[PDB]
Design a protein around this ligand. Structure first.
Ligand SMILES: Nc1ncnc2c1ncn2[C@@H]1O[C@H](COP(=O)(O)OP(=O)(O)O)[C@@H](O)[C@H]1O
Ligand SMILES: Nc1ncnc2c1ncn2[C@@H]1O[C@H](COP(=O)(O)OP(=O)(O)O)[C@@H](O)[C@H]1O
Ligand SMILES: COC(=O)CCCC[C@@H]1SC[C@H]2[C@@H]1NC(=O)N2C(=O)OC
Ligand SMILES: COC(=O)CCCC[C@@H]1SC[C@H]2[C@@H]1NC(=O)N2C(=O)OC
Lengths: 422, 422
């Protein structure tokens, strides 16, 4: 009569993370996997396994009917979608609850609401979560653009009135907003339950990115005071209640000259959740599972106090210079350890990284009482880490961590790409 | 003009632990090693290496003149002795400071004081650290034994007056005290610096033992209240000042029917220090190094608050049934991870555990907000851990953790051996 068995509708490290939380709560696990993933750590640990299709994503991890049949055939109570794949797919969520299983995440209606940009802004704007100034929806655009103020983003970026009508038409065989020139990425973690509670769990800075993909994340964000945290955090907790949010989620902002501007709500657990765990002492995947089971969040807002600092390096099987993937056999893995070092990875000596999915192989997470200690622990853990047989982006991480502007802190979302050009 | 280079006068996991702290502080390392240990993780990471002798302990890690020459030839500032080997050897400490290097630990005089039992009791007794009732030093023994009260320990244990004089003479070709029948082992961690400060860092319960060797340790100790902690802890901090203690140390007690009875001060870092780290947020090996450099302890007593619970399983290369050592090649090591899991080990896939030293190969440390969470995390981390090629005592740990009396908590120092007999 509660959650007793959970289908893990994902793979790789987050599938292992979920398995770990399940096993801590005594929840039975069902590992659904493609034919290429029979040797995943979490498949090998799972109570039951069901092969849901051949290697390609389309035919396996995105196979909505096979994943639902796997829940049916095992007698499962709930499905955890992880991140990526179907986690923000409303049709999947809708179909999961229509077949009577618990979807571990928000309701389908809320996924669609926060899954479309204009709709999401409206809803934030009404909740009093600050958005980027814009036209709100939808000749008079010379003037709309006027008052928003150049530069403008139709999405092109647009620096001249001359060329408004062009960039209007150019994106328009392919809405307007203030283009923020050099913002950081600062995001707020929340949880909301079926007992009407919602909390905020400080913030993460994920400004170090390449091609919009995050490389290094940290928590808390440098420069953000407790006062400021409280303001923005409590606006997000409130937004959660207004929209009947449920489960873990993240409000992503562009943050520039002291102000927050909303850009997306990821309605799911994120890759970078561990850094918030380390600074708050909250188990975010456990709380997902509890909340899905109908439990209240296990603590109150005044129980949450940011303590110390945490960093995460996404370790990828890829050439550190060209960023082309590097699948193949890991002959040896020597993973780092010691105080303040956490290692979240499904990779082991003997394991073959397949070509079929993303290239993330491990997340290396460090914690310290200060940002400087956490960066130093990261540097030392990276130098101890050996992954023999394939190439990784460890060398990129080492360059970032020794960057003087990174050490000062507060570098913007373009920094990595500039650095890399220089 | 400070500590810039440290000789790590030890091996195995604690040598790696020390290396890690050194590297966090930017302190150069000198790995002194025997010929059998050239492939130790910490030797491979060290800035400088010096081979101090052939495989046997006697000729290498206990070679006082070779270790001192290694400090001389490298231009080192200090020597960290770890635990075991020379760490409680006053002659070594005396000779290290007489050759002008900093010994990372207390002064030689203090090692001898707390290194001999009668002397240590005197000094504790004068400090107001509670000792076990006894004769204090040294016919009239029928009566001394009388008032201490049977049962008695000459060290034999002695249950009858009849047989006092015998057991007197029997141990006396080979002092008296109350024999505590079913105590737990509860120990208090301290630090003391050259600025006149001394602190206590709660306590550990290390009652699960076999042949007097510890298997599982935890912190805090079940049943001990904050009130009680404060009392006993502050008596140990005070004892530290009275004796001019310096560095990390531990006061070990036998704890029975609500009372603490002193049995030894280990004047060094201990194997089981990590569990205290996890519950207090203190880096105990860093503080050793700071304190040795002449710095104050980096926090005050009121900054220390016990939060959560931690467990440590000493993973040994040994047959889990006969406890005979199992040296040889580890073909694969798959180490556990995830939230609340810490792994302290110099072992890696490819590494050969030699026969020459102890059988400890890794310490698996878990943390949780409650004792139950920490035990469950331990169980799950052990089930994920693979060490292929040699035998380990993991099966023993799994049996302990599933023991109902262990789960209730507070089992005594004889429990494991009884359990094992049953
Ligand atoms: N107002 C803005 N100013 C500057 N850059 C923006 C703005 N809005 C969006 N962008 C850029 O485009 C990116 C695309 O948004 P994102 O949520 O990452 O899309 P997706 O989540 O589908 O990849 C943003 O991170 C940001 O870097
Ligand atoms: N008063 C006592 N009552 C019961 N057992 C004792 C008492 N004193 C010592 N012992 C036993 O003998 C052990 C030997 O002490 P210990 O400090 O371990 O010696 P070493 O450190 O040299 O191995 C103690 O842990 C304890 O189990
Ligand atoms: C093995 O394949 C998987 O388990 C899914 C692959 C990762 C999905 C991407 S990574 C960056 C982005 C997506 N998920 C996520 O949380 N991200 C995150 O930072 O939020 C944007
Ligand atoms: C690889 O060899 C070494 O690094 C030294 C071996 C261990 C010394 C023993 S284990 C239990 C005891 C000794 N050190 C220690 O701290 N112990 C501890 O619990 O305090 C009694």
């Amino acid at each position: 009569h509660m959650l007793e068995k959970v289908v893990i509708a994902n793979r790789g490290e987050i599938a292992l993370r979920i398995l770990r939380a399940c096993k801590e709560l005594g929840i039975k696990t069902v590992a659904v996997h493609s034919t290429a993933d029979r040797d995943l750590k979490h498949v090998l640990l799972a109570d039951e396994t069901i092969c849901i299709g051949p290697a390609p994503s389309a035919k396996s991890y995105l196979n909505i009917p096979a994943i639902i049949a796997a829940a049916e055939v095992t007698g499962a109570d709930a499905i955890h979608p992880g991140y990526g794949f179907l986690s923000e797919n409303a049709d999947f969520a809708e179909q999961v609850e229509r077949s009577g299983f618990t979807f571990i995440g928000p309701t389908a209606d809320v996924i669609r609401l926060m899954g479309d940009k204009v709709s999401a802004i409206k809803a934030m704007k009404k909740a009093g979560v600050p958005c980027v100034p814009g036209s709100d929806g939808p000749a008079k655009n010379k003037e709309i653009a006027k008052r928003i103020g150049y530069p403008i983003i139709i999405k092109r970026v647009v620096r001249s009135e001359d060329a408004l009508e062009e960039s209007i038409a150019m994106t328009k065989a392919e809405y307007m907003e203030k283009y923020l020139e050099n913002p950081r990425h600062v995001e707020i973690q929340v949880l909301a339950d079926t007992h009407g509670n919602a909390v905020y769990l400080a913030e993460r800075d994920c400004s170090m990115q390449r091609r919009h993909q995050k490389v290094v994340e940290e928590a808390p964000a440098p420069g953000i005071t407790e006062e400021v945290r409280r303001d923005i955090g409590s606006r997000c907790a409130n937004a959660c209640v207004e929209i009947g949010y449920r489960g873990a989620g993240t409000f992503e902002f562009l943050y520039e000259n002291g102000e927050f501007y909303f850009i997306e709500m990821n309605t799911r657990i994120q890759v970078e959740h561990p850094v918030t765990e380390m600074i708050t002492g909250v188990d975010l995947v456990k709380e997902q599972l509890r909340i899905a089971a109908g439990l209240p969040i296990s603590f109150k807002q005044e129980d949450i106090k940011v303590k110390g600092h945490a960093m995460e390096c996404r370790i990828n099987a890829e050439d550190p210079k060209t960023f082309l993937p590097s699948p193949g056999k890991v002959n040896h893995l020597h993973s780092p350890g010691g105080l303040g070092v956490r290692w979240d990875s499904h990779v082991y000596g003997g394991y073959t990284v397949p070509p079929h999915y993303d290239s993330m192989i491990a997340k290396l997470i460090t914690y310290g009482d200060t940002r400087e200690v956490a960066i130093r622990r990261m540097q030392n853990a990276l130098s101890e880490t050996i992954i023999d047989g394939i190439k990784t982006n460890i060398p990129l991480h080492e360059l970032i961590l020794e960057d003087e502007n990174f050490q000062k802190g507060g570098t913007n979302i373009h920094y990595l790409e500039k650095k890399l050009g220089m």
